[PDB]
Symmetry: D2
Subunit: 295 residues, 4 copies
């Protein structure tokens, strides 16, 4: 037998960083959860009890904190690139570093209509994420995403004209609820190294903001034919607004809200045009995916 694939490292590393402007008093906070997994000439740790090739996961943890102390942690695409580059540069025998970062929201509070210098609210469980793969001789591959953006529209969603056969019970509808948890990922052009990543730094926040804005506006404004048709519109708009993106991926649950027929009770009308009270369904759920690129 032989090792066909191996990677190892530290997961679930919680990290907070504060920036303090001593002149103005304004403080800014960042909070993340980090995973770093390494690949390289490590097979003998598995096959021969050779720990000499292992950079201890505890040391990887230390390195995450040290790197956060010595560098900006934002945008996460940059921080992940710095962190990944460190491992392949420091350790000859390590040839890839896979860095995942989940960024947690700490939005500055407004108190009596003024932004507070050092108080923050977790205004959503929505995350901003990166997956940064630094592979020796193959540059830096970055996938950026937003996830856990939970939305609902109460009308201007439709679903009709789908295939109907002996397995089909679903009624066509011209007016339904649509609710989802948005997971949207944009995949960057390969970067040659850390200089090229740095050269594009403003594009990371700008493209996240575009992706979020497009997602929300398209969801709100599209009189949706299906989840498929709506998500495609989102993806094509994001591609049109950032040429350094190669693909956009969406993964969207269809979180169903069922009508409740109450006509058995005193003739109460709660379906069709009279539908007001619905049963949110926890499971099952539709799950709709696509990856859009340029033609």
């Amino acid at each position: 037998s032989a090792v066909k694939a191996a990677r190892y490292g530290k997961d679930n590393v919680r990290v907070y960083k504060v920036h303090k402007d001593e002149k103005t008093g304004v403080q800014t906070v960042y909070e993340m959860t980090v995973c770093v997994l390494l690949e390289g000439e490590i097979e003998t740790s598995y096959t021969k009890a050779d720990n000499s090739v292992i950079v201890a996961t505890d040391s990887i943890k230390n390195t995450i904190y040290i790197t956060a102390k010595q560098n900006p942690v934002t945008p996460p695409e940059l921080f992940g690139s710095i962190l990944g580059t460190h491992f392949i540069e420091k350790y000859n025998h390590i040839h890839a570093a896979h860095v995942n970062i989940v960024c947690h929201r700490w939005t500055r509070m407004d108190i009596d209509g003024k932004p507070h210098p050092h108080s923050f609210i977790r205004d959503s469980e929505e995350k901003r994420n990166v997956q940064v793969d630094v592979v020796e001789g193959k540059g830096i591959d970055i996938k950026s995403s937003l996830s856990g953006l939970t939305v609902l529209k109460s009308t201007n969603s439709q679903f009709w004209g789908f295939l109907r056969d002996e397995y089909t019970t679903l009624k066509e509808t011209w007016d339904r609820i649509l609710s989802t948890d948005v997971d949207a990922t944009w995949q960057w052009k390969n970067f040659s190294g850390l200089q090229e990543v740095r050269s594009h730094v403003p594009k990371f926040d700008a493209t996240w903001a575009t992706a979020r804005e497009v997602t929300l506006k398209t969801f709100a404004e599209d009189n949706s034919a299906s989840v498929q048709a709506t998500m495609y519109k989102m993806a094509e708009q994001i591609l049109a607004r950032q040429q350094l993106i190669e693909t956009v991926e969406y993964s969207l649950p269809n979180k169903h809200y069922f009508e409740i027929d109450l006509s058995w009770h005193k003739g109460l009308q709660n379906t069709g045009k009279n539908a007001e009270v619905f049963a949110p369904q926890s499971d099952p759920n539709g799950l709709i995916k696509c990856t859009v690129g340029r033609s």
Copy 2:
């Protein structure tokens, strides 16, 4: 043996309701999770297999949906009072109804700076809750709360002057992070019935808004001596602003963020005035509680 206490009903009933203004096109959505547990002359269902005394939990579920169809679901204090009153009025042998409602956030989206007529975002996992106990001959007892309001301040929190003995390792501090998940409950004067609840309806939203505003402003502005001292200030302010409240309760975790000494690595300074990178601790956590009333 004998039944000393018993209650039963339906838990985890998810409910959505939409309001549609046909004139303006503006739709408004409400989403809840409801629990109704009943008490009364039901002991023989337990002791004698006498199901005749059981209003089926499935029927309780139906009743929740019917009541939501026929009544406003907001404020939740009112909806819970209507729902609880129904069971003690409809069923002679039922003498108490215990209604818990968790209200989920669906905040109207702003698209290109304008409120959208039918699209919403789950802008926080913060909840607004009620616990409405309708007890025959004893009126309606309402506890209102907000929960899951997660906040952090990066300075202007202190903790010194605490007891020090042979069990103490904690260093005094004059500048630390404070983060919590706020659970705040206000307990209303007993109401005699549904007419009295209705007579105070505007006070429910107003008092929730006050509790939230006071919580946030006090957290942000108090140069905190301890969680204890800060939460007391919140409670006393809320009591001062609504005379129909009898008590205010807070339950606050102290979600610790630990300094990370990095001086073992190249003399890096990351403690005290130089502390920038911290380790958020998932557990354990301080837990600080108090109930404040009038003197």
Copy 3:
């Protein structure tokens, strides 16, 4: 305003302890999560920023570990009593200690049919818990429980003869699935102090074992008229087998499994006597409670 109630302490303290028999080589492990909340003459910490009255939560954490080092951690009723007694004895101004312990399963592995001396499996997420309230001048009040014991029976459950009115849609049944997550609590006679608790130590494990055995056998063997009727039988049997218990409480969800009518598809018969495939319902759920004592 004034403090009507207050308690504070450390929650979510994870604790592991190992016992090593050096003669035999057999090791035994214990793992818990502990919460200790204190009450006493602490109001000035809330009202006057008086931290002198606060035993720091960090110190409470230290004390949990020290107490575990110096004492048995089993049975949890004893450990909680020792821990709670410590705080009211050590600190004049502390007058109650509220100790909650959740015990996690680490069941010894059998390898090739022989018990292994130092390897364990989490064989269930079922917990054994205690709530120990040590109140100065009022002894030690102990509630013991098992929770998260998830069971299902595929027949020999019935539900008919329940109240039927204009809110009722549920069909009577003489053969259904019954599934629940058992939460069972037995409340001990008040103990005067730690000597009396110690004097009954073997009864704690024995009564937990009885409660579990009775729960499982009654669930399996009772041709159940309702959740109410079955749980009452469990409680009365446990009371009959331990005179130092005063009450037994059950809280049982009815985790519904719905039939699926498939007759619209090629006349497939999947209801009544032909029911084989069911839809487990995540929510809502019945919730059935009772507390049984002696007559």
Copy 4:
């Protein structure tokens, strides 16, 4: 722009099935959660609002239940193969079906030492899973796994000889706790279709049982040099015992249990040979992966 990848279907479909032996009275239950995602000539649903190509997710759900009614649900490798084959055979334009099944434990109860005919316990949250990819013209690719198997050993784990540099603080150890949640996956030889899968049916349960037995015995008996070295031994043994497997993958967290130095308190000795009380760490955690194949 163009669709580079797309798949869609129904996730989180809970399914129960009962088998009743009318002769013996013995009933046997199965419970799963199923996901089916389809690929094919579906791009126009995304690009042109063409729903004619969509087999509704609701219909996919119906099909899961119908297929469970008409076929065995065990072993899950077979059920998933039947289910996936159905979609590519029934719908000309569907060219792949991706079926994920999570099997939940319902272990028959023993009551008074005898197996009960119709009562079951969730004896572990450990799962048995399959991932069955049925791809038209490319047969059936099956990955089988066990997950959520949580174990701990209290000694006979070591970690020394790892790389030490300026990022390293971890002390070498010759005696530590090792705890993990086992996720083990075995990848089958490609099967040409459903006849070939059926021809190997007994091997599915047998290989799951082997994987579990090997995992537990190796964990318990290996005086472990590292997680890496132990997991490799597991994988090579499983490969040796089933020639129709091509690879075995493990993904193992190192769930750390930290010593607690208590020497600051009355000289208490709780480290090294005197270590009895430990602090389980919820995060971060090592994460160790490898895929082993034949040479």
